[PDB]
Amino acid sequence: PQITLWKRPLVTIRIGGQLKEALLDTGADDTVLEEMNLPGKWKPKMIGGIGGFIKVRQYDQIPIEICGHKAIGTVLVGPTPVNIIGRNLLTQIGCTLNF
């Protein structure tokens, strides 16, 4: 598909047995999801953006389906105001910027 940018590029993702709305975010190196109690091991991490840093939990090898395209990789979980699909998963679903 092609997604224009008049509005936020929110799409449906499926992770850990839940469907969620998330931004397709070319400015995000990593994928950052709203607080959720995912199973398995994790590592603490702090990530920085506008306003400063937040603390997140890094889960690896998590299956995430994005608009019917399967992905698997690292997901960071923490108190973000929006779910963010970052480049680590965008590349896996074949996403490019075009102009």
Place this chain on the structure above:
Amino acid sequence: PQITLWKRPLVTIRIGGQLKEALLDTGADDTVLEEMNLPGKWKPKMIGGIGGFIKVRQYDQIPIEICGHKAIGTVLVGPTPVNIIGRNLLTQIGCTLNF
């Protein structure tokens, strides 16, 4: 061009006669550049990201040439972690997401 996402989508922009590197950021509503001087009146504004809120200066109707494509629109200036081209200008240059 078509830009893949295995690396950060950084491009050269021209603004006020100066060349800068900036990130094509589909998760940013607005364009925000690190501290710099721009001519004309500005309005104080606050914007919020993953780490909270910052104060910025809002300059309106500013020409920016982004990887050879012309835009004229709102540019925020303040303590962003990196130079960001957001959707307000991405739309002007005809940028879409494709997968």
